[PDB]
Amino acid sequence: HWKTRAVPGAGTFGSAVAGQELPLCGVRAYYPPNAYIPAQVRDWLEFAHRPGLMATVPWTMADEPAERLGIFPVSPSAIAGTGAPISYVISLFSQWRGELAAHLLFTGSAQHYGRLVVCYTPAAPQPPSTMQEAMRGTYTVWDVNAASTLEFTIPFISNSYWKTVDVNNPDALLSTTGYVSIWVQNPLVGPHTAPASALVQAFISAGESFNVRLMQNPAL
Amino acid sequence: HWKTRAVPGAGTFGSAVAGQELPLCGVRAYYPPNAYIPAQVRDWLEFAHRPGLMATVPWTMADEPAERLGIFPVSPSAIAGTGAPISYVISLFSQWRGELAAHLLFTGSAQHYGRLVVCYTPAAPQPPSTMQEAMRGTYTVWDVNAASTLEFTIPFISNSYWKTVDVNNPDALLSTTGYVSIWVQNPLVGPHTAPASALVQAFISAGESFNVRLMQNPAL
Amino acid sequence: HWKTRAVPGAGTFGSAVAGQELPLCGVRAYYPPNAYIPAQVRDWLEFAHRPGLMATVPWTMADEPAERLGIFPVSPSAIAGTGAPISYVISLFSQWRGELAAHLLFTGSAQHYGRLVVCYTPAAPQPPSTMQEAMRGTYTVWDVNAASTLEFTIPFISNSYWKTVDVNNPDALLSTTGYVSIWVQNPLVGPHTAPASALVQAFISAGESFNVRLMQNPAL
Amino acid sequence: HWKTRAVPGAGTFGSAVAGQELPLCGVRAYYPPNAYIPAQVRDWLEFAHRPGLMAT
Amino acid sequence: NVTTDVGANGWAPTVSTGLGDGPVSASADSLPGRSGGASSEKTKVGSRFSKWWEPAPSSTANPQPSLIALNPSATQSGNASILTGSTAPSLLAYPTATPVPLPNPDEPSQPGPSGDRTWLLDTVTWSQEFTRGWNIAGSNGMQWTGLESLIFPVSTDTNWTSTSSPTAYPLPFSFVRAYPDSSWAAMYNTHSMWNCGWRVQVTVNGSQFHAGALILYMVPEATTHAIQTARDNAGFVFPYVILNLYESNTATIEVPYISPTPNTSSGLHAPWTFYLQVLSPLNPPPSLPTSLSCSIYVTPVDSSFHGLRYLAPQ
Amino acid sequence: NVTTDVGANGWAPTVSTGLGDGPVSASADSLPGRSGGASSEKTKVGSRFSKWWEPAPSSTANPQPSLIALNPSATQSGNASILTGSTAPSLLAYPTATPVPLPNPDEPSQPGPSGDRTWLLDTVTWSQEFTRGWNIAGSNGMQWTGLESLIFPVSTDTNWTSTSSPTAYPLPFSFVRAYPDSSWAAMYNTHSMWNCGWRVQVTVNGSQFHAGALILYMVPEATTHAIQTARDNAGFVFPYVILNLYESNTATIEVPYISPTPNTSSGLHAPWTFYLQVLSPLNPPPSLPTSLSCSIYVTPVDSSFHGLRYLAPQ
Amino acid sequence: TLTEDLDAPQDTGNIENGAADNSPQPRTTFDYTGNPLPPDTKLENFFSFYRLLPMGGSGAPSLSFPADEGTIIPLNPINWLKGGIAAMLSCFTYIAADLRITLRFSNPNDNPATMLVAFAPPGATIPLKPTRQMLSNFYMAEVPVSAATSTMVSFSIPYTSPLSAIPTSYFGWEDWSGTNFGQLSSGSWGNLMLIPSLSVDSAIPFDFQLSCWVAFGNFKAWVPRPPPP
Amino acid sequence: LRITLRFSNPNDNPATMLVAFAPPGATIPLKPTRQMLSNFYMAEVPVSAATSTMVSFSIPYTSPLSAIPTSYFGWEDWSGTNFGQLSSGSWGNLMLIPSLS
């Protein structure tokens, strides 16, 4: 017989421990052919790479220059609760890194013209108050009358390699990377009898270098 | 000594678990020669391949065309309770597949003539009401005066690879394949002073592609 | 199944025993790059090799020859409570060996002259009472006006290979190696209007052959 | 996991049984040189071979 | 890279033994038969045991122009064709899969060009009063939010006639009801199982002065929670194409066959459901109509029918 | 040589199995990017997974003379130079480390010679009344024993003005406040993260008749316990150089960049703090001043700033 | 890379086509690089860990059943969604894996007991009155339950469903008569029948409390679905 | 990190402890429940009556920082509310929930 001694923690169940199950089916099972079924997903990032609306920002002809249309912190208080597929993947894990792909779809008229400056400012104690202050960070002045969607990359200009997904502490140094805001650069213009307003659909998805690790119970 | 830790489920007995028995006989036993005994069976399908009566369907000269003589659904409500050797094998397991071999033995007179159309219709919400409606599925018009038995193959025209053996839900999409019915195509005829009736013995057995898996307590 | 028998001490926890932990994290973790961080320490002796003040011994012009300025036993009652980095390392372990490096820094004036004899006497029932009695052991007459610090090596002239770090019994044969004392060899002299006193900063660190083993709860 | 079954006599201590001790010292110890000490005895018969008065 | 056992993707001898046991796994069933299951890709018996009695779409390098510029494309199926003169989305949502051996031996009945064609499913109105997430459907559509008590069979009039406006287009339920005399529906009511993919296109013509966007959703197995999430921000996980009036006058979307079984049961299962919802409410120019007409088209892709028997409608 | 498992410095297949489990370990993350982190040494994107929709200082052999003899040395940085004519300590406390790949893609902004230079941080008095372990600081210094309640942001006047004398020089907090118009501080208030080493030198001129010693400490992450231990006998574990009046009139000490992150957050973190404390109280000759003036210098080594955005001071 | 550019690449695409351009847009003085893939996101790895299974009905964390008859717990995804792991599974239309399940039987009385857990295959006839003799015909396991505390035991069941892939959502009827909508009983890993056993006779009838944990081996998912709000 | 926990049970009835590993940077629930803690990497430990029960766990370096600081001169957040702390600079948090039959 083998001489054995039990270490502390006997009979304890572990979710990450292997080799605990005992066979509850004696015969060797054979599953039916399932190669005919398309859209096979194998990674959670595939969901994050899919598009997802985060904000419906309105824009009228009455809006003057330097007028703020939207602003959100790149912290677990916002990026984990946008409603987008990526926010659910971020909420499942404790840490995230990499670039974030923002897509601003101009759903206005073909006769409409104007410019909306999208600014990304890294981490700071206070967010940008004016347009020119926001334009001191990484920005892109977007002319709405060209291709339909604006491809705005939110760079991972971070202090650390990973950012924490803690909704209780979003403004931490190891949590937020900064703020992303939309401002009216050039007023919305167009011919008479054209719509006085134009909606911009803001989408957010994962970049090619986006990653998430350390699973947890959904942040929200 | 070996440092060991017990996983959850210590001392639990399993019917599919191996290596639980301790030797209750010390000497090496030698069994007597048994090669002289014939009819050695090794598989449960061998019983299913053996013949088995399912219905004794009567047929008289008074029976007019389009007259129904018998009908049964190919579901666990019928195929598992015919009394045939195959029905017992089907009841022992939870799933089944493959073709079913039906053998209609004409035990009438050599002077009798006529035709009985055997129809197999796949799964539908409502069974066939008339002969011509049943003849819209896979059928075979059988002339009784030739060889004694009719070899009618019931094809596995199924939605899924396996069919469930659940007597509580026989009309399910993953349970029944359809209905098999017998109708009078051409009336039974014969000379005067010949029997006015002729019995047809319906046998049912497993086909060459018939299979069963996932054991359970006999369905009935 | 394996036939096993438990040896005495089942379920007992051990701090030196390996293979007791069960995985509380399923995924393979990857730590961020940390090669940019300098001053990587890997041994406790590295702390002992760093300088550490043990005594601030004063020395005036009024001090006559054969005047004692300081004395300490090389036992766990003193060497483990000097306040130096080496004393903390010594207190963590039960045994120590090797040479000890003493550094007497002369923080006086460049115009000051004089001599302080540093004597190391091995183990004895009674410590040296006079200067000439202390000078019968390993000593070095140090002229203060040369380089700033005196490099005095305290040799491991021991009875055994290891010395015990027991504050309850410091005067034991297997604990102390002797006494180290400072005496005024030649009186402190210097021109008029120069400082009448000069402080000598006594540092103590581990030698190249210094070692410690058998961990314990800090001696003090 | 390994399927095991305990034989009779579980938890019993034996003076002739090996492999019961668990490490109560983590570091690898090095004993001081003792080759200078003479009269090293390794067998009980060495004592029996030494003289011994039984009767005067 | 995990402490847990994810399985060796099969059955190994060292897994189940009398000395130790690991998690049991199922192996792939090697079966012979006719190739089917996957749409657009599908193209002596003896027992093996002895008897006892016997002896890029989106790229900045290729920006697509607005509605003003000429950028024509077309979609063809059968004898049907739909043209456009401006930028238009036309994507197969998922790539086609590999065929699998069928359990049934019967040869399939194919409708061909008469069945696999682009049909005018419905004509519906898109007004500016409709807000974000408003599912639009017309006379041939069905009110399906997942909460409606469907009386079986689905052909019952109460399922299609409701007190409020319809919202969905269940396939093939809506297609068979729109054209009950079609060759596809003829085989559908005669066969117990079917198999085909689906392509849905919508044409909405607005001037260069019109604004607004519609999303063409193809929802798999539409249920209460699924339909409501398709209306929300995460809905874009499902197959989708946006019909933005800024650049487009039409949008096309195609999806291959899906089902738990290789062949779907007729009249009892809707694998795909179309949803034409509003992303950006219609923003028409002043002194012009407050609503634009929409034309919804449907296209079954590579159809096959098995199990011929009597006529049983949905 | 231990009974315990110290870890195999990585992840091995035999560690986690269904038959036995050992202590799990983390492996090194192999990342691409710009080389940074370590000061004085720093110099098409596609996802790797398919989508479902896509197809000797101290030696007896070399004794250094007292203040009397000629033994000159110098320290230079930018356009600044500091000379001495006697024995002077000048040591990099720790050797520089190897660069690491940065998580951020933006190119750094460097102040160059205008920023990396030797600045006159503060001028302070060293009297004989100061005893062992007395931290000396002047107008540009801060009272930091670890017990002071710092009101955020650190730029608040109450943090620098106290009822008692200041004690520390928090870097870069004290440097940025001393020279707010410098090119280093200009980028510091404009960038969210920075990276550089620090060199501190102090000049104290005393005659051959003066006696006393001062210790130049560079304390990492200064907190209550750390600052008090630096005053004690064990303090020499921290980077240090002694300015002994017997031989020296100046002492230099340099330390490379340290931080939990590769780049330190601006206005919210002080990696290094300078402490000029007394080892041997000033012992001046009779009929001469009872205090000597000291000049503290500061030098940022190899600076780089990432994340440009609006102006946010400390 | 260049510090400035008069003829830079424009950054406007089209998201209406059905796919998002997730590539990092080129910028001056910027160097975008990729990152190594963590094993945390892989569905084969993610679903291999155990998570508390919601008990049928309201998605409760525990289910109370009498010691007289016992209880029958279905291993059906559709039945799990009526309440977490169910929310994670609802992000996929069809799934196919080898189920790993751990049961916890909380015993309230002062006497030990024994639980009989039998595996009823997906498609098998479930008995109206669960008895020891009939459940022994299925693949069963006898688990000893301790007194005044809970006992845990783990089981492994391979993919035994007759379907090619188990659906978490179903738009249709189970039977041809159309009585049950949105359900597929066979589309599961089967049913687990429980029967408590006591050697002693208690005067008061007590109820056992059940808690379940589920993990998956060789997890495969098809046709993605939007995450829950 | 390698950690061994000891749960001393005072009453005469056995219990069960649910120890879940919350990663450094993860959102810690206000009300710890059995369902939410099961989503994290957990372990169910049987606790004996009228005595203590020991169990050992192993957690790898999961901190987002390159190296965890024992001392920190600065603030955790940009608002400057917490001084000298870094919550993410750790091996995480262990959430405990006792269970009684």
Residue numbers in the entry:
A (entry chain C), B (entry chain C), C (entry chain C): 1 to 220
D (entry chain C): 1 to 56
E (entry chain B), F (entry chain B): 13 to 55, 64 to 75, 112 to 370
G (entry chain A): 1 to 83, 88 to 233
H (entry chain A): 103 to 203
Copy the relevant paper text:
The capsid of AiV1 is composed of 60 copies of each of the three capsid proteins VP0, VP1 and VP3 organized with icosahedral symmetry.
Here, we report the structure determination of an AiV1 virion based on diffraction data affected by perfect hemihedral twinning. The unit-cell volume and the rotation-function plots indicated that a crystal with the same unit-cell parameters but with I23 symmetry (a subset of I432 symmetry) would allow the packing of AiV1 virions. This provided evidence that the crystal may be hemihedrally twinned, with the two domains composed of I23 unit cells rotated 90° relative to each other. Based on the orientation of the icosahedral particle and the crystal-packing considerations, the virus particle had to be positioned with its centre at the origin of the unit cell. However, some regions, including the surface loops of VP1 located close to the icosahedral fivefold axes and the N-terminal arms of the capsid proteins located on the inside of the capsid, were difficult to interpret.
